[PDB]
Amino acid sequence: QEAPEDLLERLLGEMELELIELRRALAQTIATFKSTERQRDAQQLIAQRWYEKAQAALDRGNEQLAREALGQRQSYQSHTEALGKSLGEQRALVEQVRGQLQKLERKYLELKSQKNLYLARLKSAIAAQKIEEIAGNLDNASASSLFERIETK
C-alpha cells in the first residue's frame, strides 16, 4: 500500500524498460529466420550443380551415369522441401508478432498523454482544499478559525 500517484511513475518507469527488451529479441528471431532462408537456397543450388552434371551427364552419350547423380540429388531434394516448408509457417508467424508490437506501442503513448494531466489536476485540488481549509473563515465566531482566535484575544 503506497501513494497511488507516486507508484504510477515507478510503474511507467518499468513499463518502457520491459517494452524495449521485447523489441531487442524480435530482431533476434528475424536474423536467424533469414539465416535458414539463405541455407535453403544453398542446398538447391548444390542440386542445380548436380543437375548441371545431369545436363552434361549425357555429354558422354551415357545414360547410366546420369542415373546416379539424379539419385544423388534426391537426398537433397527432400531436404530442400523439408526446409523449404519449415520457413513457410514462420513467415506469417512473425508477421503476427509485428502487429502486436506496433499496435502495442501506440497504446502506451495515449497513456502518457494523460499521465501528467491527472497529476496537475491532483495538485489543482490538493491546494484547493489546502488553501480554503487554511482560509476556512475570517469571522468564524467560534475561535476555531485563526482570525477569530485573535479577535477574541
Partner 1 sequence: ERKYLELKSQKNLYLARLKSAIAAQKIEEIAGNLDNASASSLFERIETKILELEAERELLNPPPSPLDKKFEQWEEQQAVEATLAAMKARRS
Are 80 and 47 spatial neighbours (Cβ–Cβ below 8 Å)? yes
Among 39, 78, 100, 142, binds a copy of itself (CB under 8 A): 100
Give yes or no for residue 142 binding ligand ADP (CB under 6 A): yes
The cell for 43 is 542446398
Comparing CB distances to a copy of itself, the nearer of 128 and 141 is 128
Comparing CB distances to partner 1, the nearer of 103 and 153 is 103
Only one of the segments 34-42, 47-55, 138-146 lies at the binding site for partner 1 (rule: CB under 8 A); that segment is 34-42
Instruction: Choose from partner 1, a copy of itself, ligand ADP, none: what does 4 bind? Cβ within 5-8 Å by kind.
Output: partner 1
Show contacts with partner 1 in window 56-115 (CB under 8 A): 56, 58-60, 63, 65-72, 74, 77, 86, 90, 97, 100, 104, 107-108, 111, 114
Are 50 and 80 spatial neighbours (Cβ–Cβ below 8 Å)? no
Q: How far is CA 78 from the centre of its chain?
A: 36
Are 83 and 36 spatial neighbours (Cβ–Cβ below 8 Å)? yes
The cell for 85 is 516448408
The b-or-e profile of 24-33 (16+ CB within 10 A means b, else e) is: eeeeeeeeee
Q: Which residues are annotated as a binding site?
A: 23, 112, 137, 139-140, 142, 144
